[PDB]
Structures are given as structure tokens and as C-alpha cells.
Symmetry: D2
Subunit: 326 residues, 4 copies
């Protein structure tokens, strides 16, 4: 039987005996993602270039895509009546939802990662959903939960086609956007990552600054000590694209710490934790080098975290090299 994201989410909510609040949140997020996808694929770009003359360009049309994407996710989540605290890459402080529209969920999101997009590189939206735990008035503190508290997480990849990957307790499920009908179609159910892959993914241009454990691990991939075939290298430079390839083909993805960047580069709350949760729910791993990403207790909603994630055998091999150097 065909399944859509809308029907799938509704049915999981029925099975969970929920009140429909999380379902409304996810519905609203799915709608935002479809609107982001349409914009990313440059629908209406002819108006920006004067097809109707100079007087027919709107206000949305002229915003940069990462601004529009933030506006779309913020507005759709607020209007779901399911959220109380919203954390976005865009805004320094957590957004506290107006009291009339408050639900119990806290959403951390990256509205359009990779947009730094002029080369038409894949870009994506990343999200993580928590339940508020405090009895207090909602505040930024409610977003400072470890990733192991996540209720749902995932990403939309605007690549050759648009796909939403959604991870919950039931596992990881992949939905392809059919732009003819604006429906996400379930195409890969309960997906699991390979135990070990053959691809490694990191920016090797910064080799001069590598931690010695990273240097050694990468040397093992290119010159395997057991004379096995060297790993192939892929690095899109857009995390959603690199992580999704890691999920589908297996292997390892690294944005590790070093001496100049002791806490890595990627953002814990809305980049590392959602991807770590997807990976763990698919039978993979995600580590900072010293602990699981999902076990870090944040103190700052924009704090950075190192991340090495992917196939468990590959992450484990990295950790062995890391422990040798520690």
C-alpha cells in the first residue's frame, strides 16, 4: 500500500494515543519543508529577473533563501499551536512563543544549512524536537536538553530530489517529495546503516590543523595496514548531503575537534544532535571523540560540538585511534 508522510505521521500518532499536538507540529514542519523546497528549486525566479517588468517582485521573492527558510519554519511552527520555545541558527536568543499559541514542544532547527548555494550545492533543513520538562514559564533553558531526550529528529535534503528523513522511537523512515502532487511518499522504511562502509568524509584541506588521531585515522583509510582496498573520499561540504550519503551508503563523516577548534565547528543543538539521533536510530554511532553526541548536556544554545558519525565499525575504529592518542 502507498503511504504518505501525512498518513504515516497521523497513524503513528493514533498508535501512540497522543492528543494530536505532535502530529500537528510535524504536519506544519512538512508544509514548511515543501515551501522551502519550492523556493530552493527557484520557482518564480523569472519574476526576480523582470519577466513582468520591474514592479512585480514581492517581498518574499527578494529575501535570501536562508532568511525565507527561517521565516517559513518559524511561522509554520508557531501557527501549529504545538511549540513553546524555538531555537534557530538565525537568531542569537531562543524564540519564546506567544502565550496564545503555546504547545509543549521545543524545536531546534537549522532552516537551510549549506546556503553559504550559489554553486547549487545540495542544501537542507535539520530539526530536533523535545518535550518541555520545566514547570516554569518557557525559556531558553528548555532547549538545553541532551540529545537523548529527543522525541523526534531528522532532516530534509534538497538534492537531486527532495527527501525528508524522520527519526523517532519507531526507527528511521525516508520520504520522497513528489512535486507533481506535493506529497512525501514513503520509499524506505525502518532504514539501518551498514555495519561498515568504504567512504570517509571530511575537509582534508585543513590537514595542517588536524588532531594527530584524525591524521592517523585518515592515513589508515588511504593506506590500509592490512592491504585492504583504500576507502573512497567524498565531501560535499553541506552536512545534510554528506550525512545522508553516509546513511545510504555507509562509512564515516567527521567534523572533529582540533587545537584551534577545541569544540569543533558544527552546532550541537540543531546540527549535531539531530544527525546523531538519526544515526543511532539507524544502528549507527555519533561521537565527539570523548562521549556520545547525544549525552552532551549543553549550556549554550549555540555551542559547538565535534562530531564523528556513521557506520558503527568505522566510528569504533576511529575511537580506537583516538584512545591510543589520548
Amino acid at each position: 500500500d502507498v503511504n504518505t508522510l501525512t498518513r504515516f505521521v497521523m497513524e503513528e500518532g493514533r498508535k501512540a494515543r497522543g492528543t494530536g499536538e505532535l502530529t500537528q507540529l510535524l504536519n506544519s514542519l512538512c508544509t514548511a519543508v515543501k515551501a522551502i523546497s519550492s523556493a530552493v528549486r527557484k520557482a518564480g525566479i523569472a519574476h526576480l529577473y523582470g519577466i513582468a517588468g520591474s514592479t512585480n517582485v514581492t517581498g518574499d521573492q527578494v529575501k535570501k533563501l536562508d532568511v525565507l527558510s527561517n521565516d517559513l519554519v518559524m511561522n509554520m511552527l508557531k501557527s501549529s499551536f504545538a511549540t513553546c520555545v524555538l531555537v534557530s541558527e538565525e537568531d542569537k536568543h531562543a524564540i519564546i512563543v506567544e502565550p496564545e499559541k503555546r504547545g509543549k514542544y521545543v524545536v531546534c532547527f537549522d532552516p537551510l544549512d549549506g546556503s553559504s548555494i550559489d554553486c547549487l550545492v545540495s542544501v537542507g533543513t535539520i530539526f530536533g524536537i523535545y518535550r518541555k520538562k520545566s514547570t516554569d514559564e518557557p525559556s531558553e533553558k528548555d532547549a538545553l536538553q541532551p540529545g537523548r531526550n529527543l522525541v523526534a529528529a531528522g532532516y530534509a535534503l534538497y538534492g537531486s530530489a527532495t527527501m525528508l528523513v524522520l527519526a523517532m522511537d519507531c526507527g528511521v523512515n525516508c520520504f520522497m517529495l513528489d512535486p507533481a502532487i506535493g506529497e512525501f511518499i514513503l520509499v524506505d522504511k525502518d532504514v539501518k546503516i551498514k555495519k561498515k562502509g568504504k567512504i570517509y568524509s571530511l575537509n582534508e584541506g585543513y590537514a595542517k590543523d588536524f588532531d594527530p588521531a584524525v591524521t592517523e585515522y585518515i592515513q589508515r583509510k588511504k593506506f590500509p595496514p592490512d592491504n585492504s582496498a583504500p576507502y573512497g573520499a567524498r565531501y560535499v561540504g553541506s552536512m545534510v548531503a554528506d550525512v545522508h550519503r553516509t546513511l545510504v551508503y555507509g562509512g564515516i563523516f567527521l567534523y572533529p575537534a582540533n587545537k584551534k577548534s577545541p569544540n569543533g565547528k558544527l552546532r550541537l543543538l540543531y546540527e549535531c544532535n539531530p544527525m546523531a539521533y538519526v544515526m543511532e536510530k539507524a544502528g549507527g554511532m555519533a561521537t565527539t571523540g570523548k562521549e556520545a553526541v547525544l549525552d552532551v548536556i549543553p549550556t549554550d544554545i549555540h555551542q559547538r560540538a565535534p562530531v564523528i558519525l556513521g557506520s558503527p565499525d568505522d566510528v569504533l575504529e576511529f575511537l580506537k585511534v583516538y584512545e591510543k592518542h589520548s
Copy 2:
């Protein structure tokens, strides 16, 4: 003033005082590219998954779209594709003067991960009075009349290079129209990104090894280059065009003549690069100067910003 691919191509054809044949070729290719884009973005995938209660692989469909649209243009006589072992000879009633070599959906082995994919094309005019044959496609890239690619990335863009320069068109899917968004584009003199599969490090020639070491540990103490390698040639080359820098697919052990195909991968990208003021070399000569003997022959390629390719060549010359 707004401009479309259709209007732009038509006007350049009028300026050229042509007969309209190459214009019909380019219109037909534009239509094929829009149809490939639609399929790549998975329009209609709901029907494959049973929405109505119960299709070709994308690279096969893409080949069929380019082949059929080019044949029905009445502008072509020899068609070379990655998909077909032998050149396709157009039937007499539909024959025009142009030879087209193309890659209908480059990067599709990894399509499963939704990596950017693309279509690559190069167009030659047939020289002979002879009956068309596979040998008519054995021309050096210097003889190209037009070349370019369509990148199906975050958005779909067609890059078209001709004598008049390089022009970039964005597909607006709301109206199915390619809109001219970057005119007479030129690549940066020197970039800050290098692009190659470093998994082959063990098999690299010493010149490639040394060049990459220069990017990571610059001898003038400039900042190291960043690395990007999508693993789909159209994506990596387009990034090279837009941001500058260098792209390499040199020879290794599984590929001792390089991996990429001269006629429908290397030559079109080399032509785009040279028309944008960039460079494209095999190491020993310009890609566009290689005289092919096999329509599927491979070639090494190092291309991109001229100062970066020249820096590679300086290292290459030290080792040869």
C-alpha cells in the same frame, strides 16, 4: 531586460546568419533537459509506489530523452552517448549536419543518495561529404561549436558555451523556462578550493601528491585551500566555475589513462572552462587538443582557474 534560453539561442542564431538548424538542435536539447530535470526531481514517483493501485531507470530514460529529441530535431547525424557501445547513426530522413556527444545523466551511480547529477554535451559540425559514421565523432575538442551541461542540483541550471562566451540559465519550474541569470561568465583567476578523490592517494603520480601537499601546506604561508569533492563531475566542475579553484581526475591504478571520458565528459567541460578564461589540461597537453581514436576513450583532466592549473603544470613539469 529579461531573457530566456529560447530567445537567447534564437538571437545568436540570427546574428550568425545560420539556417536555423543548430538553433533547432539547441531548442530540442533544452526540452530534453527540462524533461530530465522533472524526472530527476521525482515528479510522478507516487505512481511507482502504488498511489493509483498499480518504469525505466533514470539514466536510461535520460538517454532516451536526449536521443529522441536530438533525432527529431532533424539537425544531427551522429550521436555518441555513454550508454551505447557504438555511435548511433541518425536515419537518412532525419539527418542534419551536427555530431553530438553527450552524457545523459552523469553521476547517476550514486543517485541513490540524492547527490547532484547532470547532463553533459558537446556539439560538432560534420566535416565529410561522406556518409556519417562513428569516425565523424573523432574530432579534437578544439572543433566544438557548442558545449555545456545541465546541473540538477539544489536548482537546475544550464550552462551553455559557444564562441560568444559562457552563459548560465536557471530553470524556473513554475513556468518551465530557462532564465538567463549570468552573462558572459569568466572564472576567477585563482581560487581557494581543490577538488579530487584523495582516496586514490596511494596510486597518485608524484606530481599530484606534491601539488596537493602545496594546497594543504602552502610554501608562501598563505592559508590552506579548502577541499570539496561531491563525486559527480557536473557538480564539482560547476562549483569550480562559480567559486574558482581546481578540479582533478588524474590517472591511477584502476584508471591509468584517467577515468573520465574524453568525448562527452572531458571535452565539454574543457570547452566551458576555456571560454570562461580557465584552463583544462591532461598534464601533457590541452584536453581540447587531444585527437581521439576511440569514442569511449578516457583522459586525465585537471581544470579550473588559470593560476591554479598553471601551478599544477609547474609541479608536473618538475617531475616530467
Copy 3:
């Protein structure tokens, strides 16, 4: 606040404190309608005409039927499905059965989709009332028993009109994102209109009451302004115009269609329910459409519907000739 059909339907179901089954039905129907719209607008027609190499209205009607049927069966919310396209009622397989009975016209192309003007989808949703094994009899409920009804118009744009106890709401399909956007809330029809809609080619076969009523629209006895006439010949188009601008739509029995021409279960009853929920009226002449007790799933009915003042005026003419 922007509102979508998906969000709207979900919230009404939360307020209803239902189990989510009717919500799943409506979500599945909304998806089917978006798929019909895409096909009606001829997405992919280039492939039918050979764009990739060598290697129809009825077929679009069949495809639309297949889309509604499959989306409804796979909803697990339905047990009996009556379609204009199928001679017999479809009984949902035991493992996929839910509580609801749906009568629908998936598309009205066979007729004039060759002129391209307008086609539409009409639906009416009932709860199964009997505890017997599911059969065509479960679709033989009076329209008064409807839980939800409505239509999609595939016109200059695609609009879905959904009527329930909460009233009538209109949603516009934004094809850029595949979302039905709420654009007209709790719609009510004008108490009196200035347009009449019927096929006057049947003039020779009209009964005297219809003849007199139409004469009053062209030659008002109070010498007020004559009504304008419009007639597309597609029920969704003609009824939607009646809802939006007011007036009256007639498809009466004539001498050659003595029981009427339109079909009660999936044309007259859904449109009668939309009209009544919007403050309008829908009569056969003898009784409210929604009060007719059907005996046969494809039976026909006369229908006169629209603004209440106009339908009441027709009914006074009708009683005069009674």
C-alpha cells in the same frame, strides 16, 4: 494565521474527540484530489506524445477513479465505496475495513473534457448505519445522514470545498507546494442571486413550472432587471458559481429524463448538503433532496438548488402548477 486543509481537518478531528479514522479518510481524499488535479492539468502529457521515443478523456476518468478508490481503501477508514464509474458498489476487503461509506464521482470528463473548460470531483461520506455485512445497502442512506461532503473544481485553479457540521470551507490548491490553503471560511450563500443556470436546450421538454419560472427570470413581471444566464454543463462548475455569486441551478426532470438526469448518491446529495450548510436550499420540487430515501445506488433525481429566495420562488411556481 495561514491554514491548510491538513491542519484544518486535523484540528476539527481533535475538537470532535474522534479516533482519527475520519481524519485519515479526509487526508487520503485530499491526496487523491491533488493527484487528479495534476493529471487533469496534463502533467507528463509529453511522454504520451513520444518525447522519449516510440516505446484520452475516458482514461483520465478511469485514472481518477483508481486514485480515489486506492487512497480510500488504503485509508483503512472505509467499508463500502460507490463510484459513478462502477456499476456495483465496491466492498472493501475485510482487513482494510473502517466505518465509513463514501459515494463519489471521481471525474466528469466523459462529456466535455475535450473542450477543457472544467471537470470536478464530488464526494459524500456516511457512517455505516447497519451492523450487517457491508453491502450496497449501506450506501442507500438519505443525504440528511451525511457526515461530510464536498467537491474539487479543476478550473482556472483547483479548489476544494468541504462541508461538515461546522459549515462550509473553501481551500485553494497551491501547486508550488501541493497544499490546499484555506481562502474562504464558513461560507454562506447570498439570500438572493441574479444568475440562473440550466440547459435551455431542453425547453421543448420542460414541465410548465420550469417554463414559467425561467420566463420570470428573463421577463420579470415587476420589470426588475433580468437575471443573467450561465451554463457550463459540468455540475461542479455550475454549482460552485451558484455558491460563490448566488442564484439558482436547475437540472429538473424533463419528458425524456422523467426521474431527472443527475445522480442522487454522488451528485445531488453532496451538492444539496453543501448548499444547506451554506444557508441555501436544494429541492427535487416535491421534497428536499437530502430527504429522498434512495433505493438504487445509481438512481437519478431532479434538483433545483441555490439561494433560498430563488429556490423558494421556484417552489411557489411549482406549487401553482401542482
Copy 4:
């Protein structure tokens, strides 16, 4: 072989041994039509209703869509470098193209009929007629005052259940269906011809009190055939493109005739009656005012009205028989 409007127009221009100017005009018009269709189908309406936190449902969306459609046709035609004078239903005066962008052609068009048609959700359309400038005078409204017999090309786009473009030239009438998945008009009906006699009549019978006696009698004969043949069916959308296209596809007759209160009819000669009359005649149909062929009227005002009765030739000739009976 598959054929697209782009390929078809280009090849007809090659056969004509033209300079490519009319081809560029037609390419530009096809692009405008695709853009109108996208807006008509309400792509992006979610943004108008606040999906990104900004609403703007102000004024009349129907009027704004007519104006946007005018802006699309105007700008695409101006930038074609193929036109010199542009007459639009939406503009009081003829638009004179700036000198640097002037080509040879004069275009009369109705860009959209949303505001004039109560059935705007049912169907809207674009109508166009293309002339060659006939004098070397500085361009002016007078360049658009040519009889329809002078048309080089004419046609319409119907934004109905699907979007179709109908293009008439000397080679005949050809019908193209827009495939929105790829933005391509696919040739689906070649060299089309109207039936000699139809079975449908189309007019607003709400005007019956004001009808000319000949119109009253003719319609009476369609409903009560003197020979007891089957009565005609009636259809009237109230959008000219929809009603005329049905007449082309199924045959029959469409009437917007003159009467004592409207002695020149209601529809406009330059961008409604003449393009439709040209499509009809190229399809083997007829188009009369009652007194002469629509295409032979020499206009004196760019917005002047003309009566029109068009469609299958046996039906139009029968109307003229009844019209003559009352003259």
C-alpha cells in the same frame, strides 16, 4: 515525432524564409502564456496568505491577476524587439514601443478576462492578433486599425482544466497542450477543421428581453426545430475563449449579436472578435456581424465593439437566413 510549439514555430519560420523576427515574437508570447498559466493556477498563493509570516490579501485578486497578465504580455512583447504598437484590452491608449526595441509587428490582445467574466474560476483565457505595420509613419494607434483580413497570426490560450494554446496562421489552425511538468506546449491537434454543422448553441439568454427579433427566432428554432429534429443543446460559460474553443472542438454556433440597445454588440473587434474570426475562418468556419464578415470591418477606434456570430458554416449560414428574413 513529438512536436513542441517552440519547434513548430521555428520550423514554420524557416519554411517562410523570414528573418526570425516573427519567430521571436511568438517565442516571447509563448513564454508570457506559460507565466500567465502559472499565476492563474495560483502557484505561490500560500505566500499571499501568510505561510512565511506575511499576508497581503488586499484589493481584488482577480483584478490584480488581469494586470499581472497584461504586464507579462507587455514586457515579453516589448523585449522581443519584434513589436512597435501594442493594443491591450487593459489599456486606454495604444502602447508605443520605445524606439530601440521596435520591430515590425502590431499586436492586439486581451491578456486575461478574469474581471470581465463571472466564471473566472471556471476558465479564463488570453486572446491575441498579430499584424504587420503597413505604413512607414511614426508608430501610432492607427497602425492597429487594420481589418482582420490583414492578420498574420492569431489565436488564444485557454486556462481551463488544462492549458491549451491555439495558433492560427496561413498554414492552418494548430492546438498545443501545455505540459506543466516541463513547460512545453505539445502539439496535440494538427490543421484542425470545424464540423460543417453542430448541435450546440452558445449565448447569454438572459438578454432575451433585448434580443433582436432575428436572434429570438433563430434560438427558438434551435429549441423547437421546425422539422422536429433533435433540439440543440445549450452551453454558455461567459468567457469568450472557453465558449469559442468549445465551438471549434464540437461544432455549433456562438453568438454575441447586436440589438437596439447595443447596435455594435458588446465584444471588442480588435482583440476579441477579429482573432476568433480568424481562427474560425482558418478552420473552415464562419464569423459574421450579421451584415458582413468580421474580418472585413475596417476599425476606426482601437476599443470599438463588433457583433459576432461564429462557428460551423451551416449554422452561421442558417442564422444569416433568419437575420435576412428580418432585415
